[PDB]
Every structure is written in structure tokens, then in C-alpha cells.
Amino acid sequence: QQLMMILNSASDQPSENLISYFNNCTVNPKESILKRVKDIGYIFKEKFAKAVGQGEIGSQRYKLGVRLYYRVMESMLKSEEERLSIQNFSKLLNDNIFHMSLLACALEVVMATYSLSFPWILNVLNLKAFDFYKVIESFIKAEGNLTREMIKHLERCEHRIMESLAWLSDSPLFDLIKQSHTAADMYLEPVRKKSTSLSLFYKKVYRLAYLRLNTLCERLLSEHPELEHIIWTLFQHTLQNEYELMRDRHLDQIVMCSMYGICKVKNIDLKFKIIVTAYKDLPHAVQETFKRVLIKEEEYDSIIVFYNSVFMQRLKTNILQYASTRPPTLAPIPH
């Protein structure tokens, strides 16, 4: 609301102080940035009508999105001016996935405001969930006027990428796993060392998955406060070394298996029944997560079918280590 009148009263072309940044650049990005709005102007409007019948509206959504895009870019560039060398500043300003991700974020804000949302806009712009993820926090941090409900919504996009969308096949997340700080830092990362993107994503995933584990242990496993850290160590040893199981799957399916699992090898016998019912009570939870779980070659079954097939089949060598004389040393709980 307070933001939405900034946009309509403002103009659809870059500010005059934003354009300075374009011209302090060693390669002026402007015509490329500007061809970029126009080329996406076609594609967006096209796919817009392809889902909403017909009315003209597509263009107004976009032309607001664009004003937000420039307002946030201008605000983002002000901070990165001090952080980046002139070389990085100019590479940023010509990086396609950067600018695409920033605009995809602007557009999601307006579309959601006037509510076919997330991850709709990623399919429209042929933008990998994991690339787009990198712009979300510095975007929230770069628009003061985002409303609670809007901030809360971008955060839920972030949590859906961390929980599933970044774990689908052809997602660059797996390319980065095999090999082994702001949005610019992550877009400037070369595809060719450290990888700040993968690091921040994993640190964030762990805090997410761990808060979801922690509530679920306070309902069903309050009896043994000690079972939590064990279940967490299992999940964390799973995400780090058997990460291939999250492909085309959902973070919460691994949280659930790590819980029945540790109650299985300690003879606690609080079975999948209570787990799924209590999980329904997690915010935004969907029943499909446990009723519909992949095994292999597109064949889906229930969560108990997954536990006894791929999860147990991959982890028996490790899980029994927990109830033995020498159980593995504990993982740290995320800060």
C-alpha cells in the first residue's frame, strides 16, 4: 500500500541517479538492461494472458514491477557501490541472471499484492529456482516499505525453494554440490573455488529443517528430550553425504524419516501414524508431502513406502551405528 503508491506516481524508466551508476560503469549496461525489460515485456504479457483468459492488465502489472525493479536496483547498487570493485560493480550490472532474478522478484511482489503465483513467475522467465533464491534477502533488505504480508510472502518463497524447488533435477544446486554476503556476491560467483552460494543455502536449509524437526520433537518425543539431537545428527549426516535423496523430493520427508528411524533403532515405536498427523499441524503443511513420495523413474508411493525402500536401503550401514556400542559423534545444532 505505502509502496504501491510510490510506484504508480513514479516513472517506468530508470531514475537519473540510478543512471549515473550505469555511467560510472566501465561497460555501460543500460541498453542491455533496457533491451532486457522490453524482451521480457513480450514474454511476460504473453504468458499472462495464457492463464487469465483476456481483458491489457498484463502490461500494467509489468510496468509497476519495472518501477519497483529500478527502485530496488538503485537502492541495492548504493550498498554494493561500497563493497564491489569497479570491475565487480560493472559485471553485476551486466549479469543476466542477476537482473532477471531482481525483476522476477519485483514482479512477484506486485502479482502477489494483486491476488497462479509463485513459482509461476519462475516458469514464465525460465529462471532456475536456485538462481532466484539468491536475490530474495537482499531484496527484502533493500525495500523498507515491504509490508509484513509481503515480507512474509517472499520469505515463504525462499522456504519453498530451500524445501523443494532447489532440489528438483536440472537445478544448479546439484552441480554445485558435486564440486565441493549479498545477492551480488552470489551472482558474481563464477560457474568455473569457495562457493558462497552453496554455503549460505546449506546454512539456511539447516536452520529451516531444524526448526521443523524441533517443534515435531516437542509434540511426539517430549518423553525423551534426548532423541532430538540424535534425530538431527541423522538428518544432517543425510543432507551432507546422501544428498542425492532430496532430488525431486521435499525437505520435510527427510525430517519425518529421520524421526521414525531413530525411534525404530531405540525401540521407541512411536510410528509413522503419529508423525504424519502431527505434521499436518505444521504451518503451510500439505498432505501430499507424505501421501505422494517418489521412489524411482517417476513411480510415486506413500511415505512408509519411501522409508522402507530408498531411505532404509541407503542408510542401514549408518542408522544401526546409532544403537551400537560406538554411536557417531553429534552434529552441531544451527545457530
Question: Which among 119, 162, 155, 156 is positioned nearest to 139, based on CA atoms?
Answer: 155
Separation of first and last alpha carbons in the chain: 35
Q: Closest Cα to residue 187, out of 199, 177, 195, 179?
A: 195
> Hey, what's the cell of 146?
515491504
Cα angle: 22, vertex 131, 133; to 5 degrees: 100
Q: Which residues contact 135 (CB under 8 A, 6 or more apart)?
A: 98, 101, 102, 104, 105, 183, 187
Q: Determine how many CB atoms are found less than 10 A away from the CB of residue 165.
A: 19
Q: Give the count of beta carbons closer than 10 Å to the beta carbon of residue 262.
A: 24
**Closest by Cα among 217, 295, 294 to 255:** 217
Nearest-10 Cα torsion for 28, 75, 135, 137? 160
Q: Report whether 233 contacts 331 (CB < 8 A).
A: yes
Is the Cβ–Cβ distance between 98 and 166 less than 8 Å? no
Q: Which residue is it, cell 532477471?
A: 100
Rounded (5°) CA angle 312-315-321: 120
Closest CA to 254 of 298, 296, 205: 205
Chain discontinuities in the chain, listed by preceding residue (C to N exceeding 2.5 Å): 55, 115, 180, 192
Alpha helices in the chain (DSSP H): 2-9, 16-23, 30-52, 57-83, 86-94, 96-113, 120-124, 129-133, 136-140, 148-163, 172-179, 183-188, 196-220, 227-241, 251-265, 272-280, 288-291, 303-306, 312-319
- Scanning the structure block, which residue is given the C-alpha cell 549479469? 95
Phi, psi of 300 (to 5 degrees): -100, 150
Residues in contact with 202: Cβ distance below 8 Å, sequence separation at least 6, in sequence order: 239
- Give the technique used to solve this structure: X-ray
196 SS3 class: helix
Rounded CA-CA distance 283/100 in Å is: 30
Resolution value in angstroms = 2.4
Three-state SS letters, 82-101: HHCCHHHHHHHHHCHHHHHH
| Cell numbers representing residue 163 in the block | 524445501
- The Cα 331–Cα 268 span in angstroms is 22
Cell of 212: 521443523
Quick one: which of 93, 63, 59 has its CA closest to 76? 93
Distance CA 149, CA 114 (A): 12
Per the CB < 8 A criterion, the answer to whether 164 and 154 are in contact is no
Using alpha carbons, select from 302, 319, 328, 225 the residue that is nearest to residue 266. Answer: 319
Cβ burial 141-152 (10 Å sphere, 16+ → b, else e)? bbbeebeeebee
Domains 2-188 and 197-323 share a fold: yes
Q: Round to whole Å and give the CA distance between 52 and 109.
A: 18
Q: What is residue 286's DSSP assignment?
A: -
* Angle formed at CA 33 by CA 32 and CA 37, multiple of 5 degrees: 115
Would you give the DSSP letter of residue 10? S
Q: How far apart are CA 187 and CA 136, in angstroms?
A: 12
d(CA 249, CA 137): 24
Angle 309-311-314 (CA atoms, 0-180°, nearest 5)? Answer: 100
Geometric angle at alpha carbon 41, from 44 and 103, rounded to 5°: 80
Handedness of CA 84, 85, 90, 94 (dihedral sign): negative
Structural domain boundaries in the chain: 2-188, 197-323
Exposed, middle or buried: residue 289 (CB in 10 Å: 0-12, 13-18, 19+)? buried
* 8 A C-beta contact, residue 209 and residue 249: no
Q: In a 3-state reduction of DSSP, which class is residue 334? A: coil
Residues 6+ apart with CB under 8 A from 327: 230, 321
Counting Cα atoms < 13 Å in the Cβ hemisphere of 39 gives 11
Contact 145, 7 (CB under 8 A): no
φ, ψ at 220 (rounded to 5°): -95, -25
When the candidates are 1.10.472.10, 1.20.1250.20, 3.30.420.40, 3.40.50.300, the CATH number that belongs to 2-188 is: 1.10.472.10
Homologous superfamily, domain 197-323? Cyclin-like (1.10.472.10)
Residue type, position 331, single letter: A
